[PDB]
Amino acid sequence: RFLKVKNWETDVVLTDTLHLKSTLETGCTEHICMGSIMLPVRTKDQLFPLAKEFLDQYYSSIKRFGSKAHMDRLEEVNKEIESTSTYQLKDTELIYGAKHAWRNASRCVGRIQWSKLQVFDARDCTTAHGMFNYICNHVKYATNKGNLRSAITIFPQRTDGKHDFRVWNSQLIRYAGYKQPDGSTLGDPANVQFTEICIQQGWKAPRGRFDVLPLLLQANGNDPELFQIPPELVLEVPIRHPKFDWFKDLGLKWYGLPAVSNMLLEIGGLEFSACPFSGWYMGTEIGVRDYCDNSRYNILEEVAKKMDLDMRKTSSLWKDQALVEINIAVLYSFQSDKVTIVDHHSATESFIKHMENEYRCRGGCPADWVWIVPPMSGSITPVFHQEMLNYRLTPSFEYQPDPWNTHVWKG
């Protein structure tokens, strides 16, 4: 079956056949759409089919489908599953899998870049200090003095569910949050719970507004250990505005490297529970969400105050005015310090070209509209006007429960 999507600004119609290869479920039914819901041990039984599908995809990608090398690989993986109950991926297959998990990431607007991904194989890692060393190298490589490069580091796969590698941080680099006795928060409110765990585990909190959190690292199912990323490795950008000189006096800064570290990478039925990956920021991530969400730094009032806007009526659009200024400031600061960043016009335009190319060469591009449309100026970006189909392909990145909810403490 063929499925058409229309852009209502250009009248370009595209045809999706890729959705046929989808297996995993959406959450939706014929009677309910769950499209806006944030989150809607394997045995050899389920394993060999998942391995086979993956290797068929990999061998097709290299124009060796049905070859002797393809068939010998299937046989070898199959032996390995029944005798050991799991299997190991070749390097080439790991690289292919990690790239494809990105290619298949329907909430990611930056996928035009999917084929340029530096894969660091850390499957020989055994200890938390070993993990720290791998993460450091990743941060240094990805940072590249401001000229950001996409990278993923892949720790050993899950075995019995009891020896998991996990990075406890949600991102490699994030600012601490501290709930104060009077109920105000110092720093980033999103990271209060995590901050609390760090303190308990023995971190000495500097207790300021922008303290870089320590890494909390779990190797091989053991209790996690704390490490401080060398400050010299953490690139940061002070935020100033091109026209407003008081902007600097707000005391704002952000880090340059967005590095998600809490997702699970699934490849051929194997589960890589620690697979931190990084790219570079779209400006609205910081300016709209991190700074202006009510649940985050929440700077809108204090910025509009200093611009002396009319704040007595929401219909003056004082919030919308302050919002644009803060986002100009974020983009200006990053560009001036030569740290890679993309604005939301440029990123969405690239995405639309990526998506058209993908329908052409691949037969589809799964896309989650709710997430692809940027959180400001939605309809003046081309994605707002693009119909999109959302479905789940493997390899994939998946959410997993926060490790502190599940970890069995060894003491």
Ligand X SMILES: C[C@H](O)[C@H](O)[C@H]1CNc2nc(N)[nH]c(=O)c2N1
Task: Give me the active site residues, please.
Answer: 108, 111, 280, 285
Our finding on whether 3 is near Zn ion (CB under 5 A) is no
Give the integer Cα–Cα distance in Å for 191 and 295: 11
C-beta of 168 vs 277, nearer to ligand HEM: 277
Q: How far is CA 411 from each of CA 220, 222, 224, rounded to the nearest angstrom?
A: 15, 9, 11
User: Interaction with ligand X in 3-42: which residues (CB under 6 A)?
Assistant: 8, 36, 38
* Helix H or strand E segment including 44: helix 44-61
Which residues, including other chains, have CB under 8 Å from residue 410's CB and lie 6 or more apart? 222, 223
C-beta of 109 vs 125, nearer to ligand HEM: 109
Give the integer Cα–Cα distance in Å for 59 and 71: 10
CB 22 within 8 A of CB 393: yes
CB of 335 to ligand X, least distance (A): 22
Sign of CA dihedral 309, 313, 314, 315: negative
CB of 260 to ligand X, least distance (A): 12
User: Interaction with ligand HEM in 143-182: which residues (CB under 6 A)?
Assistant: 150, 152
Give the integer Cα–Cα distance in Å for 97 and 298: 38
Give the integer Cα–Cα distance in Å for 360 and 143: 33
Two tokens at 281?
A: 């920021």
CB of 285 to ligand M68, least distance (A): 6
Burial class (CB in 10 A: 0-12, 13-18, 19+), 318: buried
Task: Give the N- to C-terminal CA distance of the chain in Å, as an integer.
Answer: 56
Site map (CB under 6 A) of ligand X, residues 369-388, x = contact: -xx------------xxxx-
CB of 6 to ligand X, least distance (A): 8
Q: At what angle do helices 318-336 and 300-307 cross, to 10 degrees?
A: 90
Our finding on whether 366 is near ligand HEM (CB under 6 A) is no
Name the binding residues: 36, 108, 171, 280-281, 285, 370-371, 384, 399
Burial class (CB in 10 A: 0-12, 13-18, 19+), 234: middle
Taking CB atoms, the residue at the shortest distance from ligand X is 371
Name the binding residues for heme b: 108, 399
Binding piece for a second copy, criterion CB under 8 A, among 59-67, 79-87, 196-204, 378-386 = 378-386
Our finding on whether 293 is near ligand X (CB under 6 A) is no
Our finding on whether 288 is near ligand HEM (CB under 6 A) is no
Which of 146, 87, 94 is closest to 118 using CA atoms? 94
C-beta of 43 vs 294, nearer to ligand M68: 294
CB of 108 to ligand X, least distance (A): 9
Name the binding residues for L-arginine: 171, 280-281, 285
Our finding on whether 189 is near ligand M68 (CB under 6 A) is no
Our finding on whether 35 is near Zn ion (CB under 5 A) is yes
From the list ligand X, a second copy, Zn ion, none, pick the one residue 391 interacts with, judged by a Cβ distance below 5 to 8 Å according to partner type: a second copy
Half-sphere exposure of 28 (CA within 13 A, CB side): 10
Which residue of 38, 41, 361, 408 would you call a contact of ligand M68, by CB under 6 A? Answer: 38
CB 389 within 8 A of CB 19: yes
Two tokens at 299?
A: 């700077």
Residues of the shown chain interacting with ligand X in the complex, contacts defined by CB under 6 A: 8, 36, 38, 370-371, 384-387
Residues of the shown chain interacting with a second copy in the complex, contacts defined by CB under 8 A: 3, 5-6, 8-9, 19, 22, 25-38, 283, 288-289, 292-295, 300, 314-317, 319-321, 323-324, 327-328, 331-332, 335, 343, 345-346, 368-370, 373-380, 384, 386-391
Residues of the shown chain interacting with ligand M68 in the complex, contacts defined by CB under 6 A: 38, 110, 258, 260, 279, 281-282, 285
Residues of the shown chain interacting with Zn ion in the complex, contacts defined by CB under 5 A: 28, 33, 35
